[PDB]
A paper describes a structure:
The ATP-dependent chromatin remodeling complex BAF, also known as mammalian SWI/SNF complex, is a multi-subunit remodeler and is crucial for regulating gene expression and developmental programming. Here, we depict the structures of both human SS18/BRG1 and yeast SNF11/SNF2 subcomplexes. Both subcomplexes assemble into heterodimers that share a similar conformation, suggesting that SNF11 might be a homologue of SS18 in chromatin remodeling complexes. Importantly, our study shows that the self-association of the intrinsically disordered region, QPGY domain, leads to liquid-liquid phase separation (LLPS) of SS18 or SS18-SSX and the subsequent recruitment of BRG1 into phase-separated condensates.
We succeeded in obtaining crystals of the single polypeptide created by the fusion of BRG1(172–213) to the N-terminus of SS18(14–101) with a tobacco etch virus (TEV)-cleavable segment. The crystal structure of BRG1(172-213)-SS18(14-101) was determined at a resolution of 2.39 Å with four copies of the complex molecule in one asymmetric unit. In the final model, BRG1(172-213) was resolved from aa 172 to 207, including the QLQ domain. SS18(14-101) was well-resolved from aa 14 to 79, including the SNH domain. The overall structure of BRG1(172-213)-SS18(14-101) resembles a four-helix bundle, which span residues 174–190 (αA), 198–205 (αB) in BRG1(172-213) and residues 19–39 (α1), 44–74 (α2) in SS18(14-101). The interaction between BRG1(172-213) and SS18(14-101) was maintained through hydrogen-bonding and hydrophobic interactions. The hydrophobic amino acids (I32, L54, and A65) on SS18 and the amino acids at the corresponding positions of BRG1 form three groups of hydrophobic cores. Residues A65, L54, and I32 were mutated to glutamic acid in SS18 or SS18-SSX1, herein referred to as SS18(3M) and SS18(3M)-SSX1, respectively. As anticipated, co-immunoprecipitation (co-IP) analyses showed that the 3M mutations in SS18 or SS18-SSX1 can largely disrupt the binding of SS18 (lane 3 compared to lane 2 in Fig. 1f) or SS18-SSX1 (lane 4 compared to lane 2 in Supplementary Fig. 4a) to BRG1. Remarkably, either the double (Q176A, Q183A) or the single mutations (Q183A) almost completely abolished the binding of BRG1 to SS18.
Residue numbers in the entry:
A (entry chain C), B (entry chain B): 2 to 38, 50 to 121
C (entry chain A): 1 to 39, 49 to 121
D (entry chain D): 2 to 38, 54 to 121
C-alpha cells in the first residue's frame, strides 16, 4: 500500500540504481525524484511510514554511492550498492504484490 | 549488523515459514525460537533495531498465519503469508551478505 | 551442515592471516593461535564433506601458514609462493562450503 | 600433483557435471571414466578421496534427477561443483606453463 509519491519515488530510485551501476551521473531531474517531494503495525504488515523510511534510506544510500564513486572508493561503493539493491527488491516486491490486478480475477466462467 | 540472537531468530522464522506454507503446525521449540529472547542511520544502512523491528513484525505475522489456519479464514492467511515471505527474503539477503566469507578473499596470488 | 562455530572462527582467522601474509605483514601472537583452533569418519556415503574432513584441511592450513611464515624469514621466495597458492585455494574451497551451508535465502521457497 | 589416471577422472567428472546440469544422461563410457580404476600440500590419496567423493555425489545427483527430488539434486550439484573447482584449480596451477615464464627480455 504505497501512495503515488512513493511509487514515483521508488521507480526513480530503480532508475538511479541502473545508471549508478553503469558509472553514469544522474540528471538533476532524477536526483530530485530520488529525493522525493504509524511506523509499526499490530499484524506486522508494512505501513506507509515504514515505506517512506526505507525510501529515505535509499536516497541516502545513493548519496553515499556517488560520493564513494567520485572518490574512487571502490569496496565501500559496492557495499552501499548491494544494500540499495536489496532494499529496492524488497520495495518493488511489495509494490507489485499490492498493485497486481490479474491475481484478483477468478477463472473464466 | 546481525548479532547471533538475530541470525538464530531469522533461521527459525524461515523454518517456521516452510512448515506453515505446507499447512503443518509448529513444534514447540520452533514456536519459541521465532520470538527470540531511532531505527534510522545517517547513511541508510539498516540498523540492528530496524532488523529487530522486522523480526518482531515477522513473529506477529506468524501468529496471524497460525490463527487464520484455525479460524478458517483462508484468504487473509495468504496476504500475511506473502508479507512474511518478502520480509524473510529481505532479511535473509542482508544476513547472507554480511556473513559471506568468500567475498573476503582476494584473487589468486 | 558440517561447519561448527569453532571451525567458522578458525576459518575467518585463516582468511585474515592469509591477507596479512600477502601484504608482507607478520601475524600477532593472538592470531597465530586463532589459526590453530582448539585441540575417524573422513568420508561420507554420499560424498558430502564431513566435519572431520573440514578440520583436517583447517589443520593443513595452519601448517601452511607456519611454512609460509618460516620461509618468509628465510627469504625463500619460491617456497613462499607455492605455499601461498595452496593456502589460497584451500580457503576459497572452505569459504565456499561454509557460505553454502549457512546461506539462508536458498532455504526459502517461491513466493505464495 | 596429480597422476594421469586422476587427471582423466577429473576431466570426466567435469564433463559429467555439465551434462547433468542439462538433465542429460551419461554414456556408460563416461560413467566408467567418472569412477576411474606435515607441510600442508595435497597428497595423491587426498586427491583420490575427493574424486571418489565426486563419483558418489554424481550417483546421488543422477538418482535425485530420475526420482524428481529437485531441492536435493541441487545441493549435491553445489557440493560437486565446489569440489570440481577445487581440484581444477590445483591441477591447473601444477600444470600451467605460461606462469613459469618471465617477462620478455
Amino acid at each position: 500500500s504505497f501512495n503515488q509519491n512513493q511509487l514515483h519515488q521508488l521507480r526513480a530510485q530503480i532508475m538511479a540504481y541502473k545508471m549508478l551501476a553503469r558509472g553514469q551521473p544522474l540528471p538533476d531531474h532524477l536526483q530530485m525524484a530520488v529525493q522525493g517531494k504509524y511506523f509499526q503495525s499490530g499484524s506486522g504488515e508494512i505501513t506507509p511510514a515504514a515505506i517512506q523510511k526505507m525510501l529515505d534510506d535509499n536516497n541516502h544510500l545513493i548519496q553515499c554511492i556517488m560520493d564513494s564513486q567520485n572518490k574512487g572508493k571502490t569496496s565501500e561503493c559496492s557495499q552501499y550498492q548491494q544494500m540499495l539493491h536489496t532494499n529496492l527488491v524488497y520495495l518493488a516486491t511489495i509494490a507489485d504484490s499490492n498493485q497486481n490486478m490479474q491475481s484478483l480475477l477468478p477463472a473464466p466462467p
